[PDB]
Structures are given as structure tokens and as C-alpha cells.
């Protein structure tokens, strides 16, 4: 088949400002038609992919004239300038002149401002006591870069296994992310203690952002 | 005003058989040519096949991986296509997609796309716990509300909030896999005035199970 490789793989840029995503396949894709069917598309968190630039070039519908495309052999090239919130996603090049491949991908990140995230804690509801387990919430929302730690604390002791960390992507709004970590214990476990404790460290402070509660 | 809209995915077994439709409106469904595209973690975008026109005696082709087990058709009167495919595999696990053939030389409109997964483990629908102040003062964005989906399997699960109604700092995580399920989390933040004096519940779709769950979260 024809190989599209796609570089790079993870891309930041801040906002207002030029992002170029390459494609490269493993032969030519000059038809005897002589037009050349590389394309390019982007998909958002939770959408399907969008088709941007069709024939390395051209611009389908309600594209802006911030995207634009090129071609030269088996190299290819598709450009956002003055990029905004809204182009956050991934960049896929896919050619229809053989069999049809696509690449694999370039997830755009909107590099912004650092923002210190705000912490809640949610004890567990007594609805899931009985499935055995008690999970204890610790959610931080709004904030960036993406790297956090959430530390819990037991009664004191810090407690590392149970916990589960999960991100949000990145919101198409204000460019933040949420996250949330996960301790869950044995119901039993979760009786014999009194105070939970969360605490975050991001690069927005020194000092961790604690949050608990008393049962 | 190009609509494209799949379904019919769900848990299947290896070896098993699915079908999946596709129904599109706004353009002259008739003339142009129709696409299956699926889309997995282990081998990202991946063409599947094809089927032309009318005129072309609805010609059909078909990557060299589903060759032999996937058949495409369609149905001009009622502006759909159709993928059926056989002898199902792990490796034919993935969100599949249809998309058009567009007259420019590219799939020019995809549907929303709907996820199959092929495995021999059954299906869980999941549960649902309220996240909920935690009791506490007023210092983060007002209150912060939410829902824990655990313990469910295959994925995907959607959560909306008032129905879609309320979709303003909705904060959902990607859900995470452990001893064979899923679970996530899905938040809103409102003001500490309109809650819990208004309504807020949050909705949670799992299309393996068909169930859609409401719950409202109370002060409790
Ligand atoms: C091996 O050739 C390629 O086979 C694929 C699988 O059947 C086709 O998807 C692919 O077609 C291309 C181009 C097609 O666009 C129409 O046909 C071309 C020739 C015209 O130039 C154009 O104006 C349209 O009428 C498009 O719909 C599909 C999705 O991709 C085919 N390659 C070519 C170059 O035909």
C-alpha cells in the first residue's frame, strides 16, 4: 500500500501564531490524470474528521484562507497561520490516487497561559458502599500545562495505590484542562479512616492546593 | 446542509457478523460514490470500502483486509449504504465511519461515525454515582456538580448535561481501563445560587447496553 508518515507527532503552538504539518508517502502520487489526490482533514475532540484542503491545494468549503496546502513529490504540506482556540485536534493526510491511506496523525496543542487549577473534593456517595469499593474524588479544573500530581493523604499517611488519574482534552474555549484522580478503597478500608486528603502541585504554585474532608 | 448519519455498532464476538447503515441527506444522494471508513487505536485511519453508481453497475471495492467478509451496497431510494460484514476479528475493532465520495477527489463529509468492538468478553452497562459538595466553602468557580460512570464495558459512553440544555464548562474525562472496565467522570460548574434552587442532571449514554441513565444530583 502506499505509506503516508506524518510529522510531527504531537505539535504545540500559541495562538495568533504558524503551525506546519508534513506528510510524506512512499511513492508518488501523480495519477495519469494527471491531478495528484493528497488531502488533508481535521478532527476535533469528540467530532469525525472535516475535510480542509482537497488536491494538496485547494480549499473546500468554509475553510478559511488560514489553511492552505502544497505539494512537491512525495513530500506535503498543509499550514495554519494566525491559529486560534477552534484549530485545536488532529491533522490527517490521506491520498486517494491509489488505494486510499491516511496518515497517522498530528494532534495540535494550543500552548497558552499557565492557569493554576481549582480543586474539589467530593467524598463518596453512599449509593456505591455497597458495590464494596468507596471512591474518593479529587477534581481539578481549569488549569494548564497538562502536567499535575495529586497526592492523597489517609489519616495523615500518604496513600498511593487506588488512585486512577484521567485527563480532559484540551477545551476549544479557553485552552484548559480539567483532570481528575480517583482513590478508591475497600468500604471497609474507607470506615477506618477519618480524613481524606488531596493534594495537588502544579507549576502554577509551590505550595500543594489541599482540599479534604472530615466524615 | 450535507448530513451523514451512521449506526448499528455495538459488542460483537470473533468470529461474529454486523451490520452497519448510513443514512445521508441534503445532496442528490444518487450521484455520488460512498465511503467506509473505520478508525482504531492500532492502526489509526483505515479505508474500507467502496461502492459507485448507478450507471457504473454499483461497482464495489474493497481493502485487501475485509476482502471476502465486508460487503457494501446501497439504496438510492432511501439515500443509504450499507456495510455488512463477517467472521468478525479483533483487529476489525475500531469507530467506523461513511463519508461521501465528493466530486472534488476526496471524502468530503463524514458522519458522526459508530464504535464496533470485537471481543469475547460481554457487555456491562455502567454505573453511576453523584459527585456532589462534597460540603464544603464556596471557592472554585460557584459549584461544582458531577457524575462517576464506573464499571462499564465496551466503550464509548456519551454524558450530557439538562439533556444539552446546559453544555457550558462541561469537563469530562477520557475514560481509563482497569481490571476490564471503564470508567470516567463528567463535571459542571454552576453558579452557588442557580443549584440546588434549579434542576441539574446529568445524562449518560452507553449504546453497547442502549441505555441512557438520568440522574439528578440533590444537595444530600
Ligand atoms: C485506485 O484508484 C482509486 O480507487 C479508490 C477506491 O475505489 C477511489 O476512491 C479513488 O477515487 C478518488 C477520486 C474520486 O473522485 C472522483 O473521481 C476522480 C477520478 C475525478 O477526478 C473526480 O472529479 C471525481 O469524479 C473520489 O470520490 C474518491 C473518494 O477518491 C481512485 N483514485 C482515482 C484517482 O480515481
Known amino acids: 500500500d502506499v505509506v503516508l508518515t506524518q510529522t510531527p507527532l504531537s505539535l504545540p503552538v500559541r495562538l495568533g501564531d504558524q503551525a506546519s504539518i508534513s506528510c510524506r508517502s512512499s511513492?508518488?502520487?501523480?495519477?495519469?490524470?494527471?491531478?495528484?489526490?493528497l488531502h488533508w482533514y481535521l478532527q476535533k475532540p469528540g467530532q469525525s474528521p472535516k475535510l480542509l484542503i482537497y488536491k494538496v491545494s485547494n480549499r473546500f468549503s468554509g475553510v478559511p484562507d488560514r489553511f492552505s496546502g502544497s505539494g512537491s513529490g512525495t513530500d506535503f504540506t498543509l499550514k495554519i497561520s494566525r491559529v486560534e482556540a477552534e484549530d485545536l485536534g488532529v491533522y490527517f493526510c490521506?491520498?486517494?490516487?491509489?488505494?486510499?491511506?491516511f496518515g497517522g496523525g498530528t494532534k495540535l496543542e494550543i500552548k497558552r497561559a499557565d492557569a493554576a487549577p481549582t480543586v474539589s473534593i467530593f467524598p463518596p456517595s453512599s449509593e456505591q458502599l455497597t458495590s464494596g469499593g468507596a471512591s474518593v474524588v479529587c477534581f481539578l479544573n481549569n488549569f494548564y500545562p497538562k502536567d499535575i500530581n495529586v497526592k492523597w493523604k489517609i489519616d495523615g499517611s500518604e496513600r498511593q495505590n487506588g488512585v486512577l488519574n484521567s485527563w480532559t482534552d484540551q477545551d476549544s474555549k479557553d485552552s484548559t484542562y480539567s483532570m481528575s484522580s480517583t482513590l478508591t478503597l475497600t468500604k471497609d478500608e474507607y470506615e477506618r479512616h477519618n480524613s481524606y486528603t488531596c493534594e495537588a502541585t502544579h507549576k502554577t504554585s509551590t505550595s500543594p492546593i489541599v482540599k479534604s474532608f472530615n466524615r | 446542509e450535507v448530513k451523514v448519519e451512521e449506526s448499528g455498532g455495538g459488542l460483537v464476538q470473533p468470529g461474529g457478523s454486523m451490520k452497519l447503515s448510513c443514512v445521508a441527506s441534503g445532496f442528490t444522494f444518487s450521484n455520488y460514490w460512498m465511503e467506509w471508513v473505520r478508525q482504531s487505536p492500532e492502526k489509526g485511519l483505515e479505508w474500507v470500502a467502496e461502492?459507485?453508481?448507478?450507471?457504473?453497475?454499483?461497482?464495489?471495492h474493497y481493502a485487501e483486509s475485509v476482502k471476502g467478509r465486508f460487503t457494501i451496497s446501497r439504496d438510492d431510494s432511501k439515500s443509504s449504504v450499507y456495510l455488512q460484514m463477517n467472521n468478525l476479528r479483533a483487529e476489525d475493532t475500531g469507530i467506523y465511519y461513511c463519508?461521501?465520495?465528493?466530486?472534488?477527489?476526496?471524502?468530503?463529509?463524514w458522519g458522526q461515525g459508530t464504535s464496533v468492538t470485537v471481543s469475547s468478553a460481554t457487555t456491562t452497562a455502567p454505573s453511576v454515582y453523584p459527585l456532589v459538595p462534597g460540603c464544603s466553602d464556596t471557592s472554585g468557580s460557584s459549584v461544582t456538580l458531577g457524575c462517576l460512570v464506573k464499571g462499564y464495558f465496551p466503550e464509548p459512553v456519551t454524558v450530557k448535561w439538562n439533556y444539552g440544555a446546559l453544555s457550558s464548562g462541561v469537563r469530562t474525562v477520557s475514560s481509563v481501563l482497569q481490571s476490564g472496565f471503564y470508567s470516567l467522570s463528567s463535571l459542571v460548574t454552576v453558579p452557588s445560587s442557580t443549584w440546588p434552587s434549579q434542576t441539574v442532571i446529568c445524562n449518560v449514554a452507553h449504546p453497547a447496553s442502549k441505555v441512557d441513565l438520568i440522574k439528578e444530583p440533590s444537595g444530600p
Open positions: 463519508t461521501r465520495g465528493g466530486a472534488v477527489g476526496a471524502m468530503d463529509y
Open positions: 461502492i459507485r453508481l448507478k450507471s457504473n453497475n454499483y461497482a464495489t
Open positions: 511513492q508518488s502520487l501523480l495519477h495519469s490524470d494527471g491531478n495528484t489526490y
Open positions: 490521506s491520498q486517494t490516487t491509489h488505494v486510499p491511506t
